[PDB]
């Protein structure tokens, strides 16, 4: 499924990530935006091996387990195909227990470089929540 903008938004929140560790909701769509295009069957090897799996392109080394990435740990304990689903849930299950890992969101490189210190709030203008 490739969300829209506000729907993403809309299932987000109602999964409870609009302010989770202090985020507002427009961190998050950004993220997403940036990371997979809004397509929950995004994936993308990275060099060490490794592959970034769903909407919020979360990483097989250390929070799910493909099968495939030598050293991985899987610390949300699910398989790296379930972050691929239409329903967000897993993803957003997952992602709650990164950025709380200690780095908040900069676990996203791409919130990081793309997201970080921008007007995010953009991101969920004219939404209905």
């Keep these: 499924k490739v969300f829209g903008r506000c729907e993403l938004a809309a299932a987000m929140k109602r999964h409870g ?14 993220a997403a935006k940036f990371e997979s295009n809004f397509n929950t069957q995004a994936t993308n090897r990275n060099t060490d091996g490794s592959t970034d799996y769903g909407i919020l392109q979360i990483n097989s080394r250390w929070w799910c387990n493909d099968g495939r990435t030598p050293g991985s740990r899987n610390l949300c ?3 790296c195909s ?3 689903s239409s329903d967000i849930t897993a993803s957003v299950n997952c992602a ?23 007007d995010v709030q953009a991101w969920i203008r004219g939404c209905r929540l």
């Design 17 to 30: 990530l609009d302010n989770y560790r202090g985020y507002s909701l427009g961190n998050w769509v950004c």
């Design 96 to 118: 709650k227990k990164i950025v709380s890992d200690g780095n908040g969101m900069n676990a996203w490189v791409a919130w990081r470089n793309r997201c970080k210190g921008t």
């Design 77 to 79: 304990n699910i398989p």
């Design 82 to 84: 379930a972050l691929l």
